[PDB]
Amino acid sequence: PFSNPNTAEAFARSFVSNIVSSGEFGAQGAEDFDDIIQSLIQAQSHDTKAKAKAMQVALASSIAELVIAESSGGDVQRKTNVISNALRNALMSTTGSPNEEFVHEVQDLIQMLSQEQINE
Amino acid sequence: FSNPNTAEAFARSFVSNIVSSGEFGAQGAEDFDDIIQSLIQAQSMGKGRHDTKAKAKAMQVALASSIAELVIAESSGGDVQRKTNVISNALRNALMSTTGSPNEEFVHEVQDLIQMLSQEQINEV
């Protein structure tokens, strides 16, 4: 989905809409996701495979870190399931595919970052 | 990384340290430069209407993960410990030079991300 800058723009709009609709995040939380995803999508703009991988991981890691920073510890599993659902749905509606690898990366990153000193 | 003037200087110093290490070739150094410059622009843009502590953490993690992923991408699996040591040393010197702390929390984040990303399907060869 991060092939086309227009597909990327369309995925971002759809993901943030899925976050707003969940009822799990307030005004500021949905805005946090929007500011961060919009920034990284815009940055993702000659390409190498290595650079594409770095940008895909930067986006996955930014989403994972927001889940932790928005959560209060005990609700990380609930917010992980809500963000996983929002992601799967936006990918499926914008691409016809659920991009399970991208979702796996975000889930793995959420679990690793729940233990980093930046989040202690 | 909240101070644009510092951010830019850190980018230049870090990339200089990567080039001087001799551990990364010309393409590697180019990939690092392009990615670190994009993530600085992202750090500024990520402030949007009102900067928040949660957004600042998300953008520091995005920068750390982008560095960790290129370490994996620029090798092909084998020499990960040497490259982790060289990148950690390049980062510490660039942080000390531009801030006067080694910011070992940020460096540890990058070392943890190298460990975890070296497991992921995107990195399978």
Residue numbers in the entry:
A (entry chain A): 10 to 54, 60 to 134
B (entry chain B): 11 to 135
Passage from the reporting paper:
The X-ray crystal structure of FlSp NT dimer was also solved and contained a single dimer in crystallographic asymmetric unit. The model could be built for most of the protein, excluding NT residues 1 to 9 in subunit A and 1 to 11 in subunit B, C-terminal residue of subunit A and loop, including residues 55 to 59 of subunit A. All the obtained structures were compared to WT MaSp NT in order to determine the overall structural similarity and to identify structural differences for the key residues. The high-resolution X-ray structure reveals more details on pH-dependent interactions between acidic residues of monomers. The most obvious such interaction occurs among Asp 122 and Glu 130 of both subunits. This interaction is possible only at low pH and requires that at least one of the acidic residues—presumably Glu 130—is protonated. Another notable contact occurs among Glu 84 and Asp 41 of the same subunit, described previously as “handshake interaction” in MaSp NT. This interaction in turn may alter the relative placement of α-helices and favor necessary interactions between monomers, such as salt bridge formation among Glu 40 and Arg 59 of the other subunit. However, this salt bridge is present only in one side of the dimer, since the loop, including Arg 59 is disordered in the other monomer of our crystal structure. The intersubunit salt bridge formed between Asp 40 and Lys 65 in MaSp NT is also present between Asp 41 and Lys 65 in FlSp NT and an additional interaction between Asp 44 and Lys 65 was identified. Based on the X-ray structure of FlSp NT, Glu 130 was identified as a promising candidate as its protonation would favor dimer formation by alleviating the electrostatic repulsions with negatively charged residues present at the dimer interface, and this supposition agrees with major chemical shift changes of Gln 131 upon dimerization of FlSp NT.
